């Protein structure tokens, strides 16, 4: 056995046979004979890993012939993973030798020998991420013997390096012996760093594929959760159940259950009497960190092995298969992402050692995390009980499930908004019921209009229309005593009770009660209710609304404006003009913007005109107060459309913008010589009739300026009083300076304001309609008369101030 001399024998002999070793392929010497065999073996290994990556099967072959080059007794791969913040190095391939099959060295998932961060050189290398060579293992300060006593093995010479993918260590491979050498001659260290360099290329491929799959799963689950969170607003239970059931093939679990925590924070006044009343001993168990009580009131568990068997527990007992472990009640005690290696071999939590069902189900890996709702408040605990792959939970699964639970916990604003919206809707319904009761006229006060308990013995509801009409024919006034067929219908003469009867009578004049077969009781009750609807403010009260209705009825009947419209379109107007000022608070539209009233926020433009419409439609929506019940759907929709064009059109702001079209229509009325054919022309057009109707909407509410001066003076005084009230109410609540007509101390300069109002806002609807129809000239003539009277008063005051200036 030579020592050093035979150095020029091996290679220089150049195998002087040309066929030695049995078969060459063109080799020259020994150095050229190892090269070709190594290249062929490495190429075969590369071809093995070409497709359908098989990490273990090929790393085993790589380590099989790497040991021999190093003379190492055994070679072993140590996989690396992370759990709940601390890394862990599992034992995947162990004791690989040149004379071993794959199954002899592979370690199944239920046979790992995991090492922590620091214990042993296997962990010191992971912390260092560098090579370590230990000549004798007794000398190094850090070295574990836990892998010595089980294996019945003794180690005396180690050589380990970690497999790194950038900055993240993937695994560590360590030769455990040297055999024919005491201290791992450094010549072997370089080749070990190099021969294992292209074997690292496959470990990182496997790691990259695993990470890609995990992140694809996370993206899919997040997208599905976002899909089904936004479907609709639902309570917490249904939303969470939907979002959890919808994504169950991506979690790769077998069983997982979601527990819900009761959110009763503060007990109610009588709940806590007994506790300090010498009974009902107070709670003493664990508490949620925020200070609440831990009480799972609903647990939904999903089973994915065998059959879905999805079931809900409405009040789980203490011996539930999920809550009995004591882990779900511990995540509620403090917010931690609990992760367990071996559930059966645990002391803190009492996991059942035996099976649970005939299928033989034993829990091995558990992962529980809380559901925080963006307020650091624990809302529930979701626990996953195993993996389909069979391997214990890794860090990627932890990140995936943490992301899912974090998104779901963030998705509690939807349920909170659902509850708030339900409460607000219920409160609005209650308020509407109150208003309806306080506006509708009761049975004991409807007898003023039609007395049926005196004439008959029956309640008003328990009567026939033919018999009901007999009372009306007598109580209702005639068409001549109150002359509702005139343009100078004085209002202050009659009491507020007579106006309801006048309204009913003019509803009878149109011939509409019997045309659409509406019920008389409902009509009377609706008139009384709408009369009660108006407030008691100075001017805009029931009197003004009924005056508008009567003026428009006079326009239709004695103004010959009824020819264009049918009887149905006249039913929808006398009703719309009668309730157009139904809930007026005195303040005009401009005030709602400056006072930040809720009316301004609800409605953009025409704050108060658009608000009377909704109240008016609400009043005639419920039965026993609805006079449109018998109308079919088409007629009812047409009437709704007519009212919604009518009530809003009474606004003066919309009057100014949209007067030119009415002027054009009136001008176009002059090229038709036969006014009996203009009726035919205009009785078919829709938009033209709508414009004319919206114009007569505001040509009648601006009335009381065309009435005899005796009535006009009092009406003007009432209007000025209302404006002064608004102005006085404006310099204290808003602390501003009212406009001159709203100054109570500016009352002397009233007539000039009146003449300015007449010549600017008025005298256009009253001139175009006079030109359109000569039938409606008297209102224009009286308007001019009142204008001249107010100008005379203005000149009188001008003379007074002039005398003050030149006395």
């Amino acid at each position: 056995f030579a020592d050093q001399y035979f150095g020029r024998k091996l290679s220089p002999e150049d195998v002087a046979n040309a066929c030695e070793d049995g078969c060459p392929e063109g080799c020259t010497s020994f150095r050229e004979l190892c090269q070709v065999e190594e290249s062929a073996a490495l190429f075969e290994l590369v071809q093995d890993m070409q497709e359908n990556v098989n990490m273990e099967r090929v790393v085993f072959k790589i380590l099989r012939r790497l040991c021999s080059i190093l003379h190492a007794d055994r070679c072993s791969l140590f996989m690396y993973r992370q759990r709940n913040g601390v890394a862990e190095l599992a034992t995947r391939l162990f004791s690989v030798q040149p004379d071993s099959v794959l199954e002899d060295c592979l370690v199944p998932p239920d046979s790992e020998i995991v090492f922590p961060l620091d214990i042993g050189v296997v962990g010191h290398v992971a912390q260092t991420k560098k090579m370590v060579n230990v000549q004798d293992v007794m000398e190094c300060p850090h070295f574990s013997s836990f892998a010595d006593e089980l294996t019945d093995y003794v180690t005396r010479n180690i050589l380990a390096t970690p497999i790194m993918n950038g900055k993240d260590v993937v695994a560590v491979i360590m030769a455990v012996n040297k055999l024919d050498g005491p201290c791992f001659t450094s010549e072997d260290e370089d080749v070990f760093l190099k021969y294992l360099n292209f074997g690292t290329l496959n470990l990182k491929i496997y790691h990259l594929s695993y990470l890609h799959n995990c992140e694809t799963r996370r993206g899919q689950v997040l997208l599905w959760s976002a899909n089904k969170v936004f479907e609709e607003l639902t309570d917490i239970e249904r939303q969470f159940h939907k979002a959890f059931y919808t994504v169950r093939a991506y979690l790769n679990c077998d069983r997982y259950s979601v527990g819900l925590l009761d959110m009763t924070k503060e007990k109610e006044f009588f709940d806590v009497w007994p506790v300090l009343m010498g009974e009902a001993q107070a709670y003493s168990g664990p508490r949620t960190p925020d200070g609440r009580e831990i009480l799972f009131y609903k647990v939904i568990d999903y089973i994915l092995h065998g059959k879905e068997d999805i079931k809900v527990i409405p009040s789980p007992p203490a011996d539930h298969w999920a809550l009995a472990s004591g882990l779900p009640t511990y995540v509620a005690e403090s917010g931690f992402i609990c992760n367990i290696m071996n559930a059966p071999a645990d002391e803190m939590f009492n996991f059942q050692e035996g099976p649970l069902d005939d299928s033989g189900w034993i829990v091995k890996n558990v992962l529980s995390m809380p559901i925080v709702n963006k307020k650091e408040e624990i809302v529930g605990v979701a626990t996953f009980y195993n993996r389909k792959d069979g391997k214990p939970f890794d860090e990627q699964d932890e990140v995936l499930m943490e992301s899912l639970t974090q998104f779901l916990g963030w998705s509690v604003l939807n349920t909170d908004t659902y509850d708030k919206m339900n409460k607000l809707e219920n409160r609005k319904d209650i308020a509407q019921d109150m208003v309806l009761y306080h506006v509708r006229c009761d049975r004991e006060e409807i007898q003023l209009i039609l007395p049926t308990r005196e004439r008959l013995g029956k309640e008003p509801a328990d009567c026939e229309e033919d018999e009901l009409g007999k009372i009306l024919k007598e109580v209702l006034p005639g068409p001549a005593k109150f002359d509702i067929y005139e343009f100078h219908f004085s209002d202050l003469e009659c009491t507020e009770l007579e106006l309801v009867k006048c309204g009913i009578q003019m509803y009878y004049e149109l011939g509409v009660v019997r045309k659409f077969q509406i019920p008389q009781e409902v009509l009377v009750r609706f008139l009384f209710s709408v009369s009660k609807g108006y407030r008691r403010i100075t001017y805009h009260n029931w009197r003004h609304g009924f005056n508008v209705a009567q003026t428009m009825f006079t326009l239709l009947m004695t103004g010959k404006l009824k020819s264009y419209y049918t009887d149905l379109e006249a039913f929808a107007m006398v009703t719309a003009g009668l309730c157009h000022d139904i809930d007026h608070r005195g303040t005009n539209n401009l005030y709602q913007m400056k006072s930040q009233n809720p009316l301004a926020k609800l409605h953009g433009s025409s704050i108060l005109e658009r608000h009377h419409l909704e109240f008016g439609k609400f009043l005639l929506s419920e039965e026993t107060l609805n006079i449109y019940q018998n109308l079919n759907r088409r007629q009812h929709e047409h009437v709704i459309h007519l009212m919604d064009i009518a009530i809003i059109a009474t606004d003066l702001a919309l009057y100014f913008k949209k007067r030119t079209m009415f002027q054009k229509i009136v001008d176009e009325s002059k090229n038709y010589e036969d006014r009996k054919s203009w009726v035919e022309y205009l009785s078919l057009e829709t938009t033209r009739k709508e414009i004319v109707m919206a114009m007569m909407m505001t040509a009648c509410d601006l009335s009381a300026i065309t009435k005899p001066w005796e009535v006009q003076s009092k009406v003007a005084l009432l209007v000025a009083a209302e404006f002064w009230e608004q102005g006085d109410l404006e310099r204290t609540v808003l602390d501003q300076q009212p406009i001159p007509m709203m100054d109570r101390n500016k009352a002397a300069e009233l007539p000039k304001l009146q003449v300015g109002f007449i010549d600017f806002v008025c005298t256009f609807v009253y001139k175009e309609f006079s030109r359109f129809h000569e039938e409606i000239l008297p209102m224009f003539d009286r308007l001019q008369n009142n204008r001249k009277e107010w100008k005379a008063l203005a000149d009188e005051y001008e003379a007074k101030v002039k005398a003050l200036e030149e006395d």
């Binding site: 709940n84 998932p109 992402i337 290696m341 071996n342 071999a345 100014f656 600017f760």
Partner: protein, 46 residues
Amino acid sequence: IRSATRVMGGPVTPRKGPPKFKQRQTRQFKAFNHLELHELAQYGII
């Protein structure tokens, strides 16, 4: 045991002490047409 490398049941670790759980991540995510519009402004309209 012969089948596995002297280990059965579940995995075994050379650690004895109190388990430490994750602390949870709380910081990663956190004018209409007019000659002179104001002629009618002196009244209630606008």
